[PDB]
Design a binder for this molecule. Structure first.
Ligand SMILES: O=C(Cc1ccc(O)cc1)Nc1ncc(-c2ccc(O)cc2)nc1Cc1ccccc1
Ligand SMILES: [Ca+2]
Ligand SMILES: [Ca+2]
Ligand SMILES: [Ca+2]
Length: 190
């Protein structure tokens, strides 16, 4: 099943992979000084996202713990200012390590993060994300930025064409977009 099929090979020297991360580094660099801290990352990728998704305190704590673990896996730390080339080096180490974990059936930081996000989107605890649940927070949270893109990306994530998203579909597409430059994940953010 495509929802469990992940590439064994990264493409770190592909300019498209580098540019995806470059776009994020600049987005997350709040004070615009060309260095990223774990403070800035957690503020934009966690504080702001959880608030916009209307997470509970418990869901926010859990998502923050995931994001901290994930970005420390890239060499990030609170108060530690890191320029982009080193940021990218951290991502290279992280992706390589996590893909080995994936292939050995060991837990991954990326799947833990996906669980935390999925839990918030799944407001009724159905174990599924319906189109209405997705549309509610897609544009608001900053994940989709258009209605067209939002409905497209939903169809694109719904790998088994069930009309709804499960945690494995979502995570596998997130991992494909950020770790492996997987062409099957290309539409995730519109
Ligand atoms: O996209 C998400 C949410 C998410 C969705 C599915 C899933 O399985 C796991 C997480 N988060 C995310 N996922 C990845 C990154 C990220 C990626 C690369 C990078 O260099 C730094 C941050 N940042 C973020 C935060 C963010 C902020 C604003 C708009 C979109 C997303
Ligand atoms: Ca900064
Ligand atoms: Ca649901
Ligand atoms: Ca599905």
């Amino acid at each position: 099943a495509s929802k469990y099929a992940v590439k064994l090979k990264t493409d770190f020297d592909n300019p498209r992979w580098i540019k995806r991360h470059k776009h994020m580094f600049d987005f997350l660099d709040i004070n615009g000084n060309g260095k990223i801290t774990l403070d800035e990352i957690v503020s934009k990728a966690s504080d702001d996202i959880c608030a916009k998704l209307e997470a509970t305190p418990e869901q926010t704590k859990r998502h923050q713990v995931c994001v901290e673990a994930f970005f420390r896996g890239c060499g990030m730390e609170y108060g530690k200012e890191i320029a982009f080339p080193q940021f990218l080096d951290g991502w290279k180490q992280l992706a390589t390590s996590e893909l080995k974990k994936w292939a050995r059936n060991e837990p991954t930081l990326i799947r833990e993060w996906g669980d935390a996000v999925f839990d918030i989107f799944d407001k009724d605890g159905s174990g599924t994300i319906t189109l209405d649940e997705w549309k509610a927070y897609g544009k608001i949270s900053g994940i989709s930025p258009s209605q067209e893109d939002c409905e497209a990306t939903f169809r694109h994530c719904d790998l088994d064409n069930s009309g709804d998203l499960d945690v494995d579909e979502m995570t596998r597409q997130h991992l494909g977009f950020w770790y492996t430059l997987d062409p099957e994940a290309d539409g995730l953010y519109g």
